[PDB]
Symmetry: C8
Subunit: 140 residues, 8 copies
């Protein structure tokens, strides 16, 4: 299955095993992590609520989570095809699709987005990424 936003708990459990994170399978089930929560996973939630203590292990997790976000199918929630707009700018920018869609952004609104909003609301932590997406949104 590829529609990560529509994933239930079972689909997340399978993904943890294919990425070598069987250690955290039961934790993700007692917390009832589904696709929506997995795509919005934060550094604090991994450490405190899921028991992922090592910062290096967390960095491995976000490495795999970024890979999943990059090749996910967002058609069921991305009406303006925001994913392929980010992808046409740079392939690694497709990971930010669900973050921008969760706070109600689309192609029509990109020119009104500020860099702080991309940080606080969309979860775009890399400044170089914010700078290129911000600039590309202005030249439309």
């Amino acid at each position: 299955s590829n529609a990560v936003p529509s994933w239930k708990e079972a689909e997340v459990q399978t993904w943890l095993q294919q990425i070598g994170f069987s250690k955290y399978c039961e934790s993700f089930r007692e917390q009832q992590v589904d696709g929506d929560l997995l795509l919005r996973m934060t550094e604090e939630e991994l450490q405190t609520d899921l028991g992922m203590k090592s910062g290096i292990t967390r960095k491995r997790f976000f490495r795999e989570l970024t890979e999943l976000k990059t090749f996910a199918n967002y058609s069921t929630c991305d009406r303006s095809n925001l994913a392929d707009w980010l992808g046409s700018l740079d392939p690694r920018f497709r990971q930010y699709t669900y973050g921008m869609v969760s706070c109600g952004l689309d192609r029509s609104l990109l020119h009104r987005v500020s860099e702080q909003q991309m940080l606080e609301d969309c979860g775009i932590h890399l400044g170089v990424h914010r700078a290129r997406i911000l600039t590309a949104a202005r030249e439309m």
Copy 2:
């Protein structure tokens, strides 16, 4: 029933079971949570006063609470139909109805509201949402 602002404890208890939160039923009853308190629920009250320690569980709770706020009937307290003004801007903006109505806002007053008031007093935490409501309130 659908008029959440008018909900008594029984309606909150039924709603908690329909969303799979029976585990927290007695906590919501000992605290005597009704519709007004449920609509004004903060993250600290869930953690401290209702025993919902997991931040992931809280995010699931606010996921269900945001959907309830979005499709609730506010006729008994929103006389200026502020809900449909928010809804016509974006369906997900309807959740902020009770927050704005609780601090005495209506359509007549929207153009005089600042973003700090929307953050501190109305509870609109997403910056993109505050910016969009501000712009629409000014075009009148």
Copy 3:
């Protein structure tokens, strides 16, 4: 009786019973809470000095206290009838009467009050409320 500013401990004890807060009768008795102290009640005093640990219980209390402050008779201390001026502007504003009257405000002085003074001295915590009262004070 209804003149809360003139209430002694007996009237406060009766009011707690009528709002279902008999559980906190004994606490309000050892602290000797009368009408003046009840009208100037703060959240910190409820938590620390009266033993109201739950923030949800405190929010219910201020819900009832706001109802009492809104429909109280302030004739014994409000010489300029500031209560009905606030009330005619918005029903929710009549609760702030005792706070403004305690620091010596009246209709004659309202136009000289700043928004910070309303927060620090009168206890108007909602920014939208301060903004509306300030504007109305200037239109006279």
Copy 4:
């Protein structure tokens, strides 16, 4: 006797009995509180040094102390009759007499006093009160 500035420890003990604060008599005795210290009392001293833990009890104490300060005899230390100048402006302003006389203010010097000085040096905590005293002092 009413000349609080000239009070020794005996007169303070009598006053504590007249306001129902016999519980704190011995604390005021070992700390050797006289009239000068009573008129300059701060909340931190009540809490830490006199053992008055309850914030509600402290608010009751300052209620009695403010009435004592308002109707006190300042003949022995108020050389410019600053008390009757404050009182003629507003009866509630007479409480600030000793705080202003202790740092050497008089009628001659009032126009040179800033609002920051009234807070830090004179102990006028209410902002609305500081603003009214400033305005009246400059219009002389």
Copy 5:
């Protein structure tokens, strides 16, 4: 004796007895407090090094120390008769003589002294006092 700057431990021990502070005699003796240290006594030194925990007791101490500083003989260290310059402005300003003389000030230098220097270096904590001394220094 009145020339406090020349006091050794014996004169300080006697002064503590005449003001009713015999309880702290031993502390002042083991710490070897003489006249110079007594005139430069700070609140931190009383609390930490001399065991004066009560803030009310410290306020009583500085009440007596201010009385001693006011009527002291500064002939042995005040070449410009700075004491009588302060005294002619206001009698209680004479207490600040040793503080200003210790940092090398005199009448010749008064006109370039700033309000921060009077606070940090001379120990004039009352703002109203600093404002009048500043004004007098510029009118020379």
Copy 6:
């Protein structure tokens, strides 16, 4: 093999032995450190997650890691040959290749990079280095 970006855990373990850090082999294996994590290693990760407590030992580690980063094989991930651009500017600058490539920079994008981005996102901690790279990017 010199292509550190493609290194697996086995290649990292071999490198630790060649630099005399066999003591930390087990830590690097339980944390599953590969080439990508090794090139992005931070001082906080060494101390907290890998047990390298001594700051002097950590400084020795970064000495060896900087040597590895300087002469590494970037053919598998450096599409614009950014390493040889940095190297032609100064040999010590080649260490920053993976940091810039990890956030997707290339020769085409260098002129749009700010000094804050080189610090927060690329990991160029030396200010003199950031200043020289920024200047060279502008002269193109």
Copy 7:
């Protein structure tokens, strides 16, 4: 009298001459000589030398300030910075070693900022910094 040239023995003798024999061995185990004595900080007294009492520390700096004021700095003050400070005010001579230690001289005085005098030279009294600044600029 050449405090900058003092070895540990001279510091031990001076501690006895000012009534601080109680702290003699502490200054000995820490190997305090003239250079360290002239650069003594309050944190070093409390933590490393065991002088817990802040009042005792104030007595120490009272005696140390007298020593700094009348010391002979000829062996390290080539521009006679001590007598420049002294002509401005006798008590300003104590700051000589602090200013000489960070490489200052008369040639450099007009280029010194007040923050440099606070952080680097150790002139903590603001009134003193203001007076030295004014005199350094009028040259």
Copy 8:
């Protein structure tokens, strides 16, 4: 004499010649060589080498400043930055390794800011930063 090229043996010998034999085993267990010795910070001495006393650390940096001042930097300073700093003021030669480590030379000095000398080169004295900056601009 070439401190940048010193291995652990030379550091152990230097500690003995300065009377710091007490800390020989610490410098050996931490494997301190010439490069680490020249980049020694106060935090590393206190936490990692066990030098608890702040006075002992000040004595150490006193000797380390002597070593840094008279070291031979030919093996890493091709622009002879050491003798440029030294000719400006003898105490400035210690900053050679700190500046050479971040790739600076005479050609680059005029582009260095005062903040860079603090954060990157380790020139903690403000008066020193001000003097080097001014001299670097007159070239």
